[PDB]
């Protein structure tokens, strides 16, 4: 009768989302109050982390200081967590989604549906592959996405922000909006899944360019042009690459312009790009110094874009994306970045 | 045969444009190389400013240290400057364009056209003021750019709004350089209204900074402000309006740079942080004034409730509403209904 929800993931973001979804499932009649959350088990200094969560109602490791609602139940086995869910909320690091889908494949409730909160992009036959497609194809369920200018710490703290839900099915879109929306977490539902999703990968390429601007000492008007041309390349690339409908207007949603802006004024891609431009240190060197060795996604995405556009003969139509690639991997002097924007397709 | 250009105005902005325009007018066969610039005569240490420009080719008061192309001729009488021009570039401060137009009226060439670079509104668009008094087709140039940066050839872009496609390509040819990139669109009114409405959003963004909110909250305020800009334009502008025009420099880019750096944001932040008045911050903004005008026309249309960001700025500036309510006013926004 009422729809059962499983939150597949329990990290910083998954626990922030638990707070909201646990809250709204308990409140709202149409949702089963019992919300399962799959927790990868960890020795929390002796006690099982899933034990600590069900007793203390606090993800002491990944969202310390916050009270997860009591109707949210940690479950160490993902199949047991999801077996009865009508709605699956995928919120794990991209690196673990494959494993989780492998365990879940063939164990879901009939007509179960999913929504991916996983930002970024995967690899596929067409070069880039959307994570929501990896999930939906492996599990055989219809997929929505949730993407926007938001971060777990602020969503847990109830700091005002918005997000975009991409869902092809209007009725399912409205259901997901009811599950996730609060006075400080505002949702717009749009029908273009792929377009909402591809923004999250492309925005980080634009952020590398924005960081180059900061590191080369350009002003805000130059930077605003880099961001805007970057947005226009996002639109043009989605229109040529995405299946499903692509509208310019979708880029004016939170997943598009707002996430772009926040990523270009703060975030690891911008920060490392600026340091690269200022200091001549390699992306690799800065990754070790600043991100404990984490791979920065902006440069890696630019490399994938380069291969896609080379096979289509369109490298010259995306000068900002391709300047990020050439600066990061082919030793193009970062100081020439702006020159690559002086004959842009948008101004032809 | 070749088109004659007059730059009506000679401040920082008009001098910066004269650098660009004089160069392109000399190089391109389709333009007459003799570019007039109307220069309000001033005495600079005993010599006339116009004489200094015509011998040293430097506006020593408003753009010192920059050479103007020698084919730009400073002319002190605005009628003499404009009377043979086919293209007039209006680049004076808002407060004078009314008087300048009253002197020019009737004295222009028959087929003459205009482009207004005067950002901000009169609510009535300044290019409408000009085009209706002078009787000439009007275009606009608006984007994320400032005069000092254009003078220094720092990369930036701009939008030209021009209804006639042939006139638009000529204006683009007159103005475009490697560091001043132009997109021509045909929605004149949409381009121009952005310049006024962006300052309302900027005040809101400054409130957001002053209240201690982060970049994800500021990005929502900017984005909701952009949606209200689009909605208002479709409801106000007698000319056509598409959301796609707001992806141009005049829309999203100018909005971003104003909301991250500009007078409206700076004051609004300090006011929300310290509760320092406004004026004492001022001394120590067109955004609020525009908000007031928005309130008035939204009443007439019956749509005050559909623009809570615009109205929260007005109410917080003019009706005592506590700045601290600004974010609350966005928690049931039409975009999320
Ligand atoms: N953190 C944010 O602010 C934020 C905001 C928007 C979107 N997102 C997206 O949400 C996704 C997840 O981010 P996060 O903040 O929850 O990261 P996290 O590192 O905080 O999450 C840790 C979780 O990863 C899983 N995990 C850890 N080790 C594992 C292992 N050996 N095997 C299997 N699973 C393991 C567990 O579920 C663990 O709870 C990402 O795709 C990110 O893009 C995050
Ligand atoms: K010429």
Indicate if B52 and B140 belong to the same structural domain. yes
Residues B195, B107 share a domain: no
Q: Which chain B positions have a beta carbon within 8 Å of A184's beta carbon?
A: 331
> Could you tell me if A90 and A3 lie in one domain?
yes
Q: Do B9 and B156 share a structural domain?
A: yes
C-alpha–C-alpha distance, residues B55 and B62, integer Å? 16
- Cα A53 versus chain centre, distance: 25
Q: Is B62 left (phi over 0), alpha (psi -120 to 50) or beta?
A: alpha
- Contact between B100 and B129 (Cβ < 8 Å): no
User: Closest ligand 1 atom, CA of A99?
Assistant: 33
Alpha-carbon span A150 to A148, nearest angstrom: 6
The verdict on A114 and A178 lying in the same domain is: yes
Q: From the CA of A186, how many Å to the nearest CA of chain B? A: 6
Experimental method: X-ray
CA–centroid distance for A190 within its chain: 16
B147 to chain A: closest CA residue: A221
Query: Which distant-in-sequence residues (6+ apart) come within 8 Å of B79 by Cβ?
Result: B103, B104, B107
- State the helix-helix crossing angle for B308-318 and B188-210, rounded to 10 degrees: 60
> Hey, are the CB atoms on A258 and B182 less than 8 Å from each other?
no
Q: Give the Å distance between the CA of A238 and the centre of ligand 2.
A: 42
Task: Tell me if A224 sits within 8 A of B257, measured CB to CB.
Answer: yes
Residue the block writes with tokens 């160069």: B23
DSSP annotation of B93 reads: -
From B19, B198, B218, B315, active-site residue: B198
The vertex-B139 CA angle with B201 and B178, nearest 5°, equals: 80
Q: Which residues of B touch A183 (CB under 8 A)?
A: 331-332
Is the backbone of residue A219 left (phi > 0), alpha (psi -120 to 50) or beta? beta
- A122 and A218 in a single domain? The answer is no
Q: How many CB atoms lie within 10 A of CB B37?
A: 28
C-beta of residue A22 within 8 angstroms of C-beta of residue A71: yes
Q: How many CA atoms lie within 13 A of A251 on its CB side?
A: 29
Q: Which segments of B105-164 does DSSP mark as H helices, in order?
A: 126-134, 147-151
Task: Indicate whether A169 and A261 sit together in one domain.
Answer: no
CA distance A141 to A143: 6
Of B213, B257, B335, the CB nearest to A221: B257
- Inter-chain touch B157–A254, beta carbons under 8 Å: no
Joined tokens for residue B97: 């364009």
A96 lines ligand 1 (CB under 6 A): yes
Other Cβ atoms within 10 Å of B296 Cβ, number: 11
CA nearest neighbour of A8 among A49, A40, A37: A37
Nearest to A124 by CA among A115, A136, A106: A136
The total number of structural domains in chain B stands at 2
d(CA B100, CA B123): 20
Q: Pick from B186, B204, B231: which residue ends a domain?
A: B186
Whole-angstrom Cα distance, residue A12 to residue B96?
Answer: 57
Q: Do B220 and A266 make contact, defined as CB atoms within 8 angstroms?
A: no
Which of B169, B186, B203 is the C-terminal boundary of a domain? Answer: B186
In chain B, what is the greatest distance between 2 CA atoms, to the nearest angstrom?
A: 66
Nearest CA-CA partner of A114 in A134, A96, A128: A134
Same domain (yes/no): A37, A146: yes
Phi then psi for A48, rounded to 5 degrees? -65, 135
Residues 6+ apart with CB under 8 A from B18: B7, B10, B35, B37, B68, B69, B72
Give me the DSSP letters along A53-104.
Answer: HHHH-S-TTTSTT----TTEEEESSHHHHHTT-SEEEE-S-HHHHHHHHHHH
Cβ neighbours for B23, distance < 8 A, ≥ 6 positions apart:
B69, B177
> Which CATH number covers residue A9?
3.40.50.720
d(CA B88, CA B108): 10
Q: Are residues A248 and A335 in the same domain?
A: yes
Cβ partners under 8 Å of residue A291, min gap 6: A268, A272
Secondary structure of A63-76 in HEC code, one letter for each residue: CCCCCCCCCEEEEC
- Same structural domain for residues A220 and A317? yes
**Nearest neighbour of A224 by CB, restricted to B144, B215, B335:** B144
Compute the C-alpha angle B4/B5/B10, nearest 5°: 150
Which B residues, 241 through 300, put their C-beta within 8 Å of a C-beta on chain A?
A: 243-244, 246-247, 249, 252-254, 256-257, 260-261
Distance CA B130, CA B104 (A): 10
Question: Do A173 and A210 lie in a common domain?
Answer: no
Return the CATH number at A262: 1.10.1040.10
> Is A69 touching ligand 1 by the criterion CB < 6 Å?
no
Can you tell me the distance from the alpha carbon of B141 to that of B19, in angstroms, rounded to the nearest whole number? 16
Going A213 to A218 to A219 to A223, the CA torsion angle's sign is negative
Q: What are phi and psi of B2, to 5 degrees?
A: -70, 145
Residues 51-110 of A with CB under 8 A from B: none
Q: Which helix (H) or strand (E) holds A300?
A: helix A297-312
Q: What element of type H or E holds B55?
A: helix B49-56
Query: What gap in Å lies between CA A101 and CA A112, rounded to an integer?
Result: 14
With beta carbons less than 8 A apart as the criterion, state whether A7 and A72 touch: yes
Last residue of a domain, one of B152, B186, B220: B186
**CB contact at 8 A, A115 and A146:** yes
Give the pairing of strands B138-142 and B113-116: parallel
Distance from CA of B179 to the nearest CA of A (A): 7
For residue A43, count other CB atoms closer than 10 A to its CB: 8
Instruction: Specify which residues B99 forms β-bridges with.
Output: none
- B198 is an active site residue: yes
CA within 13 Å, CB half, B186: 5
Tell me: do B138 and B205 sit in the same domain.
no
A163 beta partners:
A187
Parent domain of A218: 192-348
Question: Can you say whether the dihedral through the CA atoms of B232, B234, B235, B239 is positive or negative?
Answer: positive
């Amino acid at each position: 009768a009422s729809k059962k929800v499983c939150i597949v993931g329990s990290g910083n973001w998954g626990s922030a989302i638990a707070k909201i979804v646990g809250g709204n499932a308990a409140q709202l009649a149409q949702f089963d109050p019992r919300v399962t959350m799959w927790v990868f088990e960890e020795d929390i200094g002796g006690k099982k982390l899933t034990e600590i969560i069900n007793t203390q109602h606090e993800n002491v490791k990944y969202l310390p200081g916050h009270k997860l609602p009591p109707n949210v139940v940690a479950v160490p086995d993902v199949v047991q967590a999801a077996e009865d869910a009508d709605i699956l909320i995928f919120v794990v690091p991209h690196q673990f989604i494959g494993k989780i889908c492998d365990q879940l494949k063939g164990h879901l409730k009939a007509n179960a549906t999913g929504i991916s909160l996983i930002k970024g992009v995967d690899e596929g036959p067409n070069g880039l592959k959307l994570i929501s497609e990896v999930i939906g194809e492996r599990l055989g369920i219809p997929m929505s996405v949730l993407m926007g200018a938001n971060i777990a710490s602020e969503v847990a703290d109830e700091k005002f922000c918005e997000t975009t839900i991409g869902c092809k099915d209007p009725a399912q879109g409205q259901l997901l909006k009811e599950l996730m929306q609060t006075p400080n977490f505002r949702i717009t539902v749009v029908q273009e899944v792929d377009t909402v999703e591809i923004c999250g990968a492309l925005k980080n390429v634009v952020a590398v360019g924005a960081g180059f601007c900061d590191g080369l000492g350009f002003g805000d008007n130059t930077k605003a042009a880099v961001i805007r041309l970057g947005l226009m390349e996002m639109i043009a690339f989605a229109k040529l690459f995405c299946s499903g409908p692509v509208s310019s207007a979708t880029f004016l949603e939170s997943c598009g312009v707002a996430d772009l802006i926040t990523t270009c004024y703060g975030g690891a891609n911008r920060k490392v790009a600026e340091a690269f431009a200022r200091t001549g240190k390699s992306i690799e060197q800065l990754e070790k110094e600043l991100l404990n060795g984490q791979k920065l996604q902006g440069p890696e995405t630019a490399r994938e874009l380069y291969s896609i556009l080379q096979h289509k003969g369109l490298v010259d139509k995306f000068p900002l994306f391709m300047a990020v690639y050439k600066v990061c991997y082919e030793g193009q002097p970062v100081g020439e970045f702006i020159h690559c924007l002086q004959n842009h397709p948008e101004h032809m």
